[PDB]
Chains A and B, each alone.
Chain A
């Protein structure tokens, strides 16, 4: 799967026209320790009792859905556009 770096597409925020958009791939980002779920999990894990939450260990699928981050060049607002799952994904490869 190959998609180009830029795309003329409708902008759904702050500028209601078709504009140029920079296209990149969205990345998950680290889970911060100060998130409420993480704090609750750490407090629960403290003490005796062992592992207190499930740990998933099945791992059926081998790919991930590809999420494009679209950044409008005129009104600097970003958007998410999910694509079908694929094994190989390149951004702006040769035609």
Chain B
């Protein structure tokens, strides 16, 4: 019966304990470029440019940049299909996403590894390892700390 814009956002759109007040001045200094990933985190202190309830905590690419706003493409699930939605928010409610920071670091590191590997014509495995079973270890331990365990009685 009640489906207003901010219905059900009592806790989601509330500032954290001892974290009230407007955004820092350094937030206005962050750089945004077209096509880079961004997190939509609603900041309740700024009322204009406020994203809808659903998009809080989502991630999307920039498709539009304005003087104080940004347009971001977010996938939203609608029953039988995902569909793209263009949400326009002020820059207070958006934050540079770290979803691909590991990817960028891996890109630069693998580049400078492959450079020297090809220089020394050594064939190197560059893909991530998903490390599983550990090898056998021939481990030493003095008998001063091999303590015996018994299940405890009831009290």
In the complex they form, whether A and B have CB atoms below 8 Å apart is answered with: no
- Residue ranges of A at the interface with B (Cβ–Cβ < 8 Å): none
Binding site for A on B (CB under 8 A): none
